Amino acid sequence: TDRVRRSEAITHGTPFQKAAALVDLAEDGSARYYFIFTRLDLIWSLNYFALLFLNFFEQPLWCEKNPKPSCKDRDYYYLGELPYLTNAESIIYEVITLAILLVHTFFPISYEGSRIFWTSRLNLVKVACVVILFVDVLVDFLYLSPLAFDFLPFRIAPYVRVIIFILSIRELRDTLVLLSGMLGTYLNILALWMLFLLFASWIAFVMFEDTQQGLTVFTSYGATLYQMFILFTTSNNPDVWIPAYKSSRWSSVFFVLYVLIGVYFVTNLILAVVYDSFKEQLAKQVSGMDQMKRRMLEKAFGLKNQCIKLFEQLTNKDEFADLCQAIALRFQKEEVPSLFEHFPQIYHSALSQQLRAFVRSPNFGYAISFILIINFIAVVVETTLNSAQKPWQVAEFVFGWIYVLEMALKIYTYGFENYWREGANRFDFLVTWVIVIGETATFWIRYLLLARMLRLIRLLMNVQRYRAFIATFITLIPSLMPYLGTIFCVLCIYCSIGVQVFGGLVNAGNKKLFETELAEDDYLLFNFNDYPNGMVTLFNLLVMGNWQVWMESYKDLTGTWWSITYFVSFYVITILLLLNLVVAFVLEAFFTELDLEEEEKCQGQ
Amino acid sequence: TDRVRRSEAITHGTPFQKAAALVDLAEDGSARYYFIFTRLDLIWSLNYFALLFLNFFEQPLWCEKNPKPSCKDRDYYYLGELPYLTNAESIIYEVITLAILLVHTFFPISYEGSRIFWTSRLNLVKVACVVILFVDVLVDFLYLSPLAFDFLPFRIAPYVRVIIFILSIRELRDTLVLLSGMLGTYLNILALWMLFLLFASWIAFVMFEDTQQGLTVFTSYGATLYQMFILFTTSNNPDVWIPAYKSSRWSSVFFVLYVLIGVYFVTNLILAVVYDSFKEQLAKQVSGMDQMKRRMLEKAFGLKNQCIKLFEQLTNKDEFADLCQAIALRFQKEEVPSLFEHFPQIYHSALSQQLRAFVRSPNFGYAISFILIINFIAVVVETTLNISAQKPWQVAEFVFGWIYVLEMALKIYTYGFENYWREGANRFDFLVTWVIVIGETATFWIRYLLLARMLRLIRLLMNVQRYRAFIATFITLIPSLMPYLGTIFCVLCIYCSIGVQVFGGLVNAGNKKLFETELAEDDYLLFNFNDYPNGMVTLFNLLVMGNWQVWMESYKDLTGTWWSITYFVSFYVITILLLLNLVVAFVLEAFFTELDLEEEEKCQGQ
């Protein structure tokens, strides 16, 4: 009842209650209308997701330019398995999600007020984008009628959807303010990297000029620079320099020195610079949150007798902020009473506490781990077979009951809340329900095998040593999520670009295609013909095993070197700036875990 | 004259000179015999290198089994270009390097004292290695005579050579001692990684069981585990899961998820762990060095006139340790008199100081760098014409060469030899300029002169004040990584030995299986283990991870035995996950040290 108590105290409470609520929620990290707005936050979140995802199901723009065969022949164009919305459906969902977007974007006026609403850059830009969207939707609708428009060259909506998405989920916007902080420092190292590629490709071009390497690979400075760029990635190693090696073994000493420097001395320098600027910008950013927290505590101060009255509320200016911080850092948050303490003879009679202490014992935990080991053995046995298996449906129900009981005993020992407040106990909760639902619905086969597999993670989580690594992993995941989301938004952009520029080129009637490395390596389903296909392709480009295959093949399908700029800038932005950020984040998380246990050790000693 | 002064002050000087030398050399980081042993250090180093390199030119043992055709047919066996030593040559060089090694390893037996010598375990292990080597050499010699032996199954010398080389250089031996502590950490994380591969391969196996992915790729648990291990490296992406994708696009979700987790979450974890353990051991090592430095200074103390008598020689108990620290850094250390001071009136004639001050001027720097820009433009014009027109540029190479000679002459005229060579930039200048002067004077084969004129450009990067921060990091990282790249090289050497013994001779033009392998299909046939060079390059290829499973598949198929994979798996586990992560860590620490040093310079200026 924390949120309800806070909002009630803020909107109706006496000033000491308002101050207590403000300080409590600052420690936890027109008020009425702000609450009314926030009560729809799930609607906003889901609508913005829908808004994005509806990008996946729209028909790709080249299918409307009357191809033969038509896009009903998905085998000819190597197309995905997702449906394409009809005109009707498109119109429907466009209208619905634009209407809810218009509701959300203007609803803050109820507490911000017009002068602030128009004074504020974020609202001004969101209104700009939703107008852009509405314009484009209108235009699209009009294009229903041939009177309005003959033809559309380009669709802006796919972009604006993405933009809108990024502006809606604040943590993505703050990640982009961090990234646009470090970007200017990243451009200097990217310039020194390009100066390195230039000079190394010029040495290679002079050195091999008349050789078979020059005659068949390094045929010009441009092609040398291209090849050396690829070799920076290591992706064309050794293939690129086989002609060299053939003519003289000594050539290897050049290719080895180039690879060693590029990979070891330079790529790690790019990581070091990204790591440094990330850490600086992160420290810069958190200071803003700390300052806003102080401003909120100063508001609570404004809104010895007063100290006694506030401590009385707590039972439920610089000195004030210092006291609030001291109590926040010293004290755990207050206990919440369970729904069962109201039954005096039931909840409180000594048998209850005896069973609680028993289930709270460590030897109970050992026994539970042994029972789950026995279940793991049982499933590893059962998967030797697939009617003799039928009793293992009873074994299924048996372990189902076992986990139902263990979940019940956990909620009995700690209420609903202090059971669940550990993320592992949340995983327990989820897998218990899903497997109970599956087993009772059976009373998929393979999917129940998979789920019972998935439940085995418990034995990993239990390992005391590994549990440090796992705690790193666990805090990492939701901390990583806004960076992978930014990556994904980038992929979305790139995908859109790709389908507009390259969509339709990979098809079974194309005589050039069967000369390309996509046809030769059988990558033909990794194409930009629709939004799914592209997305997957982009993942291959991201992990970057065989990446140059696509760059090459689309060079050859489009007939212009300019096409390369796509793949190059993709590489630059994704591989260098963002994945090194991911690296740095993982590193910092790990070391933070070690600093945490080091602090615990120091304070204990 | 530092070393000569120090050694004289120790072996002949008065105790005040002894202390002054011991403190100065400790700030700089039986005495007679130890100085002799150190003066021979170049001969020892060169002998140990020679001893190592021996591995390259020795004929590979499978050639000694009289194959048909013989190893004179290098095209049939895709062999290298290096010579193989004759028996005669082998015997010669072996005997010479063994004799010099015996000399070096026994040399301390006199000055260390027998009880001390044999009490030290490093000596004892070196003696075991040399005794082994001597044995093996003796055996090989005996083998010359039919009375001794019929056959030898395996040669140990190749290994022992490496071991001796590792022992011979303290920088490497300390690098391996540092490496040895973090191993027990490493084995943890390695265990967890194995467990993850196991689980993920099980899921993949069951999940795909009946599918085309199953029916063609994930044919068994074993086959699944092997393919999932290569997919952790991402070298078989997307190829390993094309049958899944073809069957159902949704399949992609599993492989994306798995690759995401493995590459980003888990590989970074191994890096993290490596990093951590590295830094811990590095701190332990530098602490041990600091303690040894203190222990030395404490003996130099054990060896107001109390102060003045030593503070005079300082121009050449915690109270003392503090003084030694302060005097190491609060003042500029000493300088050596120039060879010109036997002609001091000319050397001191005012024009010398005036020209030195001019050469020290910033406008002289501007002029010289403008001349370097002119030379860069000149060589660009030369190459953009050549792509007899070079003959004026062949003449201009005279001018440029003697300009770089003259400017180096002015550098030494302003800084002697001592403050010249004390600067790494001037050391690089010295390293390139004289060899280029030799090449160009010998000109007064052409592309090597063009390339020299290009290598003269390298300073233009180092002079950019922004990029100078990165380039200082790079310039200190170059000599600092040498222990670690040397240890990796030693590892490679071992692996190469193994490879030539186990796989040498299999890649040959008569082999019917070979033309079915991915080696032959990708034209990799030159990247083989048939001789030591070949294998070395192959190992490089392995190290770089480019197409690396090609070799593991092809040698699996050529040997017809799964066990062969143990070679390539152990190689990956050692090199890729332990060593290269180390290298990573080292570069990150170097860069952050550079930023801390610059921040200290900034804050002290502020």
PDB file of N, CA, C and O in Angstrom, chain A residues 129-181:
ATOM      1  N   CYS A 129       6.969  15.329 -33.823  1.00  0.00           N
ATOM      2  CA  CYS A 129       7.001  13.988 -34.405  1.00  0.00           C
ATOM      3  C   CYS A 129       5.601  13.408 -34.580  1.00  0.00           C
ATOM      4  O   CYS A 129       5.331  12.737 -35.580  1.00  0.00           O
ATOM      5  N   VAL A 130       4.708  13.615 -33.613  1.00  0.00           N
ATOM      6  CA  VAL A 130       3.343  13.118 -33.766  1.00  0.00           C
ATOM      7  C   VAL A 130       2.596  13.855 -34.874  1.00  0.00           C
ATOM      8  O   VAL A 130       1.746  13.267 -35.547  1.00  0.00           O
ATOM      9  N   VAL A 131       2.934  15.118 -35.133  1.00  0.00           N
ATOM     10  CA  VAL A 131       2.404  15.807 -36.308  1.00  0.00           C
ATOM     11  C   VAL A 131       2.970  15.231 -37.602  1.00  0.00           C
ATOM     12  O   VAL A 131       2.240  15.043 -38.576  1.00  0.00           O
ATOM     13  N   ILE A 132       4.232  14.990 -37.717  1.00  0.00           N
ATOM     14  CA  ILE A 132       4.871  14.313 -38.786  1.00  0.00           C
ATOM     15  C   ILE A 132       4.196  12.998 -39.100  1.00  0.00           C
ATOM     16  O   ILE A 132       3.842  12.677 -40.243  1.00  0.00           O
ATOM     17  N   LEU A 133       3.956  12.195 -38.120  1.00  0.00           N
ATOM     18  CA  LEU A 133       3.242  10.975 -38.149  1.00  0.00           C
ATOM     19  C   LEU A 133       1.834  11.134 -38.666  1.00  0.00           C
ATOM     20  O   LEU A 133       1.354  10.387 -39.522  1.00  0.00           O
ATOM     21  N   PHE A 134       1.113  12.094 -38.090  1.00  0.00           N
ATOM     22  CA  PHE A 134      -0.265  12.335 -38.504  1.00  0.00           C
ATOM     23  C   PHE A 134      -0.353  12.790 -39.958  1.00  0.00           C
ATOM     24  O   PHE A 134      -1.216  12.327 -40.710  1.00  0.00           O
ATOM     25  N   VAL A 135       0.483  13.663 -40.410  1.00  0.00           N
ATOM     26  CA  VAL A 135       0.695  14.072 -41.748  1.00  0.00           C
ATOM     27  C   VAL A 135       0.887  12.894 -42.668  1.00  0.00           C
ATOM     28  O   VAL A 135       0.239  12.746 -43.707  1.00  0.00           O
ATOM     29  N   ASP A 136       1.803  12.030 -42.374  1.00  0.00           N
ATOM     30  CA  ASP A 136       2.136  10.882 -43.129  1.00  0.00           C
ATOM     31  C   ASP A 136       1.040   9.847 -43.188  1.00  0.00           C
ATOM     32  O   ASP A 136       0.793   9.224 -44.225  1.00  0.00           O
ATOM     33  N   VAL A 137       0.303   9.648 -42.150  1.00  0.00           N
ATOM     34  CA  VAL A 137      -0.852   8.839 -42.057  1.00  0.00           C
ATOM     35  C   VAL A 137      -1.971   9.353 -42.923  1.00  0.00           C
ATOM     36  O   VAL A 137      -2.634   8.623 -43.667  1.00  0.00           O
ATOM     37  N   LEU A 138      -2.249  10.613 -42.874  1.00  0.00           N
ATOM     38  CA  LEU A 138      -3.153  11.323 -43.693  1.00  0.00           C
ATOM     39  C   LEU A 138      -2.833  11.198 -45.160  1.00  0.00           C
ATOM     40  O   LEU A 138      -3.698  10.957 -46.006  1.00  0.00           O
ATOM     41  N   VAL A 139      -1.619  11.408 -45.544  1.00  0.00           N
ATOM     42  CA  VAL A 139      -1.079  11.250 -46.844  1.00  0.00           C
ATOM     43  C   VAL A 139      -1.277   9.853 -47.375  1.00  0.00           C
ATOM     44  O   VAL A 139      -1.735   9.621 -48.500  1.00  0.00           O
ATOM     45  N   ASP A 140      -0.951   8.856 -46.615  1.00  0.00           N
ATOM     46  CA  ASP A 140      -1.190   7.483 -46.855  1.00  0.00           C
ATOM     47  C   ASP A 140      -2.645   7.151 -47.061  1.00  0.00           C
ATOM     48  O   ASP A 140      -3.012   6.332 -47.911  1.00  0.00           O
ATOM     49  N   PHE A 141      -3.529   7.727 -46.320  1.00  0.00           N
ATOM     50  CA  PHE A 141      -4.932   7.585 -46.412  1.00  0.00           C
ATOM     51  C   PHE A 141      -5.487   8.181 -47.679  1.00  0.00           C
ATOM     52  O   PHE A 141      -6.307   7.589 -48.386  1.00  0.00           O
ATOM     53  N   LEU A 142      -5.096   9.365 -48.015  1.00  0.00           N
ATOM     54  CA  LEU A 142      -5.376  10.051 -49.218  1.00  0.00           C
ATOM     55  C   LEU A 142      -4.955   9.253 -50.421  1.00  0.00           C
ATOM     56  O   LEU A 142      -5.642   9.183 -51.447  1.00  0.00           O
ATOM     57  N   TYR A 143      -3.760   8.663 -50.351  1.00  0.00           N
ATOM     58  CA  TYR A 143      -3.237   7.779 -51.385  1.00  0.00           C
ATOM     59  C   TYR A 143      -4.142   6.552 -51.607  1.00  0.00           C
ATOM     60  O   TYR A 143      -3.980   5.837 -52.597  1.00  0.00           O
ATOM     61  N   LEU A 144      -5.168   6.339 -50.768  1.00  0.00           N
ATOM     62  CA  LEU A 144      -6.263   5.485 -51.020  1.00  0.00           C
ATOM     63  C   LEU A 144      -6.964   5.840 -52.302  1.00  0.00           C
ATOM     64  O   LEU A 144      -7.437   4.977 -53.051  1.00  0.00           O
ATOM     65  N   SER A 145      -7.088   7.091 -52.611  1.00  0.00           N
ATOM     66  CA  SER A 145      -7.701   7.707 -53.721  1.00  0.00           C
ATOM     67  C   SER A 145      -6.710   8.167 -54.753  1.00  0.00           C
ATOM     68  O   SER A 145      -5.846   8.975 -54.393  1.00  0.00           O
ATOM     69  N   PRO A 146      -6.769   7.720 -56.014  1.00  0.00           N
ATOM     70  CA  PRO A 146      -5.798   8.133 -57.011  1.00  0.00           C
ATOM     71  C   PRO A 146      -5.797   9.591 -57.373  1.00  0.00           C
ATOM     72  O   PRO A 146      -4.840  10.089 -57.980  1.00  0.00           O
ATOM     73  N   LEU A 147      -6.816  10.323 -57.071  1.00  0.00           N
ATOM     74  CA  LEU A 147      -6.947  11.724 -57.209  1.00  0.00           C
ATOM     75  C   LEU A 147      -5.905  12.492 -56.438  1.00  0.00           C
ATOM     76  O   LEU A 147      -5.394  13.524 -56.887  1.00  0.00           O
ATOM     77  N   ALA A 148      -5.558  12.074 -55.266  1.00  0.00           N
ATOM     78  CA  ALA A 148      -4.652  12.697 -54.379  1.00  0.00           C
ATOM     79  C   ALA A 148      -3.207  12.549 -54.787  1.00  0.00           C
ATOM     80  O   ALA A 148      -2.471  13.523 -54.977  1.00  0.00           O
ATOM     81  N   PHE A 149      -2.723  11.360 -54.937  1.00  0.00           N
ATOM     82  CA  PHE A 149      -1.407  10.985 -55.284  1.00  0.00           C
ATOM     83  C   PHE A 149      -1.302   9.864 -56.282  1.00  0.00           C
ATOM     84  O   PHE A 149      -1.953   8.833 -56.091  1.00  0.00           O
ATOM     85  N   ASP A 150      -0.522   9.980 -57.308  1.00  0.00           N
ATOM     86  CA  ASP A 150      -0.162   8.998 -58.261  1.00  0.00           C
ATOM     87  C   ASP A 150       0.709   7.910 -57.683  1.00  0.00           C
ATOM     88  O   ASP A 150       0.497   6.711 -57.894  1.00  0.00           O
ATOM     89  N   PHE A 151       1.758   8.320 -56.964  1.00  0.00           N
ATOM     90  CA  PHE A 151       2.872   7.485 -56.504  1.00  0.00           C
ATOM     91  C   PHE A 151       3.529   8.099 -55.256  1.00  0.00           C
ATOM     92  O   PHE A 151       3.560   9.323 -55.113  1.00  0.00           O
ATOM     93  N   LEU A 152       4.095   7.260 -54.381  1.00  0.00           N
ATOM     94  CA  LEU A 152       4.886   7.679 -53.217  1.00  0.00           C
ATOM     95  C   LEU A 152       6.338   7.155 -53.344  1.00  0.00           C
ATOM     96  O   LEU A 152       6.527   5.939 -53.444  1.00  0.00           O
ATOM     97  N   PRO A 153       7.371   8.025 -53.331  1.00  0.00           N
ATOM     98  CA  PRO A 153       8.766   7.620 -53.554  1.00  0.00           C
ATOM     99  C   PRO A 153       9.412   6.933 -52.340  1.00  0.00           C
ATOM    100  O   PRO A 153      10.363   6.161 -52.480  1.00  0.00           O
ATOM    101  N   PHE A 154       8.931   7.275 -51.146  1.00  0.00           N
ATOM    102  CA  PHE A 154       9.596   7.077 -49.864  1.00  0.00           C
ATOM    103  C   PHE A 154       8.575   7.232 -48.732  1.00  0.00           C
ATOM    104  O   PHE A 154       7.716   8.112 -48.779  1.00  0.00           O
ATOM    105  N   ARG A 155       8.667   6.385 -47.706  1.00  0.00           N
ATOM    106  CA  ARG A 155       7.775   6.372 -46.541  1.00  0.00           C
ATOM    107  C   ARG A 155       8.569   6.779 -45.301  1.00  0.00           C
ATOM    108  O   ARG A 155       9.510   6.080 -44.939  1.00  0.00           O
ATOM    109  N   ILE A 156       8.209   7.874 -44.631  1.00  0.00           N
ATOM    110  CA  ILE A 156       8.795   8.384 -43.450  1.00  0.00           C
ATOM    111  C   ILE A 156       8.323   7.761 -42.157  1.00  0.00           C
ATOM    112  O   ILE A 156       9.057   7.730 -41.160  1.00  0.00           O
ATOM    113  N   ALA A 157       7.126   7.293 -42.073  1.00  0.00           N
ATOM    114  CA  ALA A 157       6.512   6.697 -40.944  1.00  0.00           C
ATOM    115  C   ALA A 157       7.356   5.677 -40.223  1.00  0.00           C
ATOM    116  O   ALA A 157       7.465   5.716 -38.985  1.00  0.00           O
ATOM    117  N   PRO A 158       8.022   4.709 -40.898  1.00  0.00           N
ATOM    118  CA  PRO A 158       8.853   3.705 -40.235  1.00  0.00           C
ATOM    119  C   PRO A 158       9.941   4.274 -39.332  1.00  0.00           C
ATOM    120  O   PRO A 158      10.243   3.720 -38.285  1.00  0.00           O
ATOM    121  N   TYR A 159      10.513   5.413 -39.701  1.00  0.00           N
ATOM    122  CA  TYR A 159      11.486   6.138 -38.980  1.00  0.00           C
ATOM    123  C   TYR A 159      10.920   6.802 -37.751  1.00  0.00           C
ATOM    124  O   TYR A 159      11.461   6.731 -36.639  1.00  0.00           O
ATOM    125  N   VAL A 160       9.850   7.512 -37.891  1.00  0.00           N
ATOM    126  CA  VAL A 160       9.196   8.284 -36.907  1.00  0.00           C
ATOM    127  C   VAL A 160       8.632   7.429 -35.802  1.00  0.00           C
ATOM    128  O   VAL A 160       8.594   7.815 -34.633  1.00  0.00           O
ATOM    129  N   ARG A 161       8.168   6.257 -36.090  1.00  0.00           N
ATOM    130  CA  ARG A 161       7.822   5.230 -35.179  1.00  0.00           C
ATOM    131  C   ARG A 161       8.935   4.900 -34.213  1.00  0.00           C
ATOM    132  O   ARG A 161       8.763   4.851 -32.989  1.00  0.00           O
ATOM    133  N   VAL A 162      10.113   4.678 -34.692  1.00  0.00           N
ATOM    134  CA  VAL A 162      11.313   4.440 -33.977  1.00  0.00           C
ATOM    135  C   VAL A 162      11.665   5.596 -33.079  1.00  0.00           C
ATOM    136  O   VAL A 162      11.997   5.453 -31.897  1.00  0.00           O
ATOM    137  N   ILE A 163      11.668   6.780 -33.591  1.00  0.00           N
ATOM    138  CA  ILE A 163      11.933   7.995 -32.912  1.00  0.00           C
ATOM    139  C   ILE A 163      11.006   8.184 -31.737  1.00  0.00           C
ATOM    140  O   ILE A 163      11.400   8.509 -30.613  1.00  0.00           O
ATOM    141  N   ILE A 164       9.739   8.041 -31.942  1.00  0.00           N
ATOM    142  CA  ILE A 164       8.680   8.080 -31.002  1.00  0.00           C
ATOM    143  C   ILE A 164       8.873   7.082 -29.890  1.00  0.00           C
ATOM    144  O   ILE A 164       8.681   7.356 -28.700  1.00  0.00           O
ATOM    145  N   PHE A 165       9.265   5.894 -30.201  1.00  0.00           N
ATOM    146  CA  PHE A 165       9.647   4.856 -29.320  1.00  0.00           C
ATOM    147  C   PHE A 165      10.781   5.251 -28.409  1.00  0.00           C
ATOM    148  O   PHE A 165      10.757   5.039 -27.191  1.00  0.00           O
ATOM    149  N   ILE A 166      11.833   5.807 -29.005  1.00  0.00           N
ATOM    150  CA  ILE A 166      12.984   6.240 -28.212  1.00  0.00           C
ATOM    151  C   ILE A 166      12.607   7.383 -27.271  1.00  0.00           C
ATOM    152  O   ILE A 166      12.999   7.391 -26.100  1.00  0.00           O
ATOM    153  N   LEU A 167      11.827   8.347 -27.755  1.00  0.00           N
ATOM    154  CA  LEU A 167      11.358   9.452 -26.922  1.00  0.00           C
ATOM    155  C   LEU A 167      10.373   9.026 -25.841  1.00  0.00           C
ATOM    156  O   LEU A 167      10.242   9.731 -24.836  1.00  0.00           O
ATOM    157  N   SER A 168       9.682   7.902 -26.011  1.00  0.00           N
ATOM    158  CA  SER A 168       8.715   7.468 -25.009  1.00  0.00           C
ATOM    159  C   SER A 168       9.377   6.794 -23.812  1.00  0.00           C
ATOM    160  O   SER A 168       9.055   7.111 -22.663  1.00  0.00           O
ATOM    161  N   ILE A 169      10.300   5.867 -24.047  1.00  0.00           N
ATOM    162  CA  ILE A 169      10.944   5.124 -22.967  1.00  0.00           C
ATOM    163  C   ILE A 169      12.154   5.923 -22.491  1.00  0.00           C
ATOM    164  O   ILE A 169      13.206   5.933 -23.127  1.00  0.00           O
ATOM    165  N   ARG A 170      11.978   6.611 -21.360  1.00  0.00           N
ATOM    166  CA  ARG A 170      12.950   7.588 -20.881  1.00  0.00           C
ATOM    167  C   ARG A 170      14.363   7.018 -20.823  1.00  0.00           C
ATOM    168  O   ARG A 170      15.324   7.695 -21.195  1.00  0.00           O
ATOM    169  N   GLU A 171      14.513   5.786 -20.332  1.00  0.00           N
ATOM    170  CA  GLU A 171      15.847   5.230 -20.122  1.00  0.00           C
ATOM    171  C   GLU A 171      16.615   5.083 -21.431  1.00  0.00           C
ATOM    172  O   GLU A 171      17.844   5.236 -21.452  1.00  0.00           O
ATOM    173  N   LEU A 172      15.905   4.915 -22.544  1.00  0.00           N
ATOM    174  CA  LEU A 172      16.560   4.949 -23.844  1.00  0.00           C
ATOM    175  C   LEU A 172      17.023   6.359 -24.186  1.00  0.00           C
ATOM    176  O   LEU A 172      18.109   6.544 -24.742  1.00  0.00           O
ATOM    177  N   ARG A 173      16.202   7.358 -23.880  1.00  0.00           N
ATOM    178  CA  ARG A 173      16.591   8.749 -24.095  1.00  0.00           C
ATOM    179  C   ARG A 173      17.819   9.141 -23.270  1.00  0.00           C
ATOM    180  O   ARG A 173      18.714   9.832 -23.768  1.00  0.00           O
ATOM    181  N   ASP A 174      17.869   8.741 -22.000  1.00  0.00           N
ATOM    182  CA  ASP A 174      19.061   8.980 -21.183  1.00  0.00           C
ATOM    183  C   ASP A 174      20.287   8.218 -21.685  1.00  0.00           C
ATOM    184  O   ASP A 174      21.408   8.745 -21.650  1.00  0.00           O
ATOM    185  N   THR A 175      20.096   7.007 -22.212  1.00  0.00           N
ATOM    186  CA  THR A 175      21.205   6.310 -22.861  1.00  0.00           C
ATOM    187  C   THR A 175      21.684   7.031 -24.116  1.00  0.00           C
ATOM    188  O   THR A 175      22.886   7.074 -24.389  1.00  0.00           O
ATOM    189  N   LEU A 176      20.771   7.632 -24.869  1.00  0.00           N
ATOM    190  CA  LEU A 176      21.173   8.435 -26.020  1.00  0.00           C
ATOM    191  C   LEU A 176      21.822   9.766 -25.641  1.00  0.00           C
ATOM    192  O   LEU A 176      22.698  10.239 -26.366  1.00  0.00           O
ATOM    193  N   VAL A 177      21.449  10.367 -24.512  1.00  0.00           N
ATOM    194  CA  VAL A 177      22.178  11.542 -24.025  1.00  0.00           C
ATOM    195  C   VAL A 177      23.586  11.192 -23.538  1.00  0.00           C
ATOM    196  O   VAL A 177      24.547  11.922 -23.823  1.00  0.00           O
ATOM    197  N   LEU A 178      23.766  10.002 -22.970  1.00  0.00           N
ATOM    198  CA  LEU A 178      25.112   9.511 -22.675  1.00  0.00           C
ATOM    199  C   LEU A 178      25.907   9.254 -23.954  1.00  0.00           C
ATOM    200  O   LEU A 178      27.085   9.641 -24.064  1.00  0.00           O
ATOM    201  N   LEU A 179      25.293   8.582 -24.922  1.00  0.00           N
ATOM    202  CA  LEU A 179      26.014   8.236 -26.136  1.00  0.00           C
ATOM    203  C   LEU A 179      26.386   9.486 -26.924  1.00  0.00           C
ATOM    204  O   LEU A 179      27.494   9.574 -27.463  1.00  0.00           O
ATOM    205  N   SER A 180      25.478  10.464 -27.010  1.00  0.00           N
ATOM    206  CA  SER A 180      25.794  11.726 -27.665  1.00  0.00           C
ATOM    207  C   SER A 180      26.702  12.607 -26.825  1.00  0.00           C
ATOM    208  O   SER A 180      27.163  13.641 -27.318  1.00  0.00           O
ATOM    209  N   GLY A 181      26.962  12.231 -25.574  1.00  0.00           N
ATOM    210  CA  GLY A 181      28.086  12.820 -24.867  1.00  0.00           C
ATOM    211  C   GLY A 181      29.420  12.277 -25.348  1.00  0.00           C
ATOM    212  O   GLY A 181      30.313  13.038 -25.728  1.00  0.00           O
TER     213      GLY A 181
END
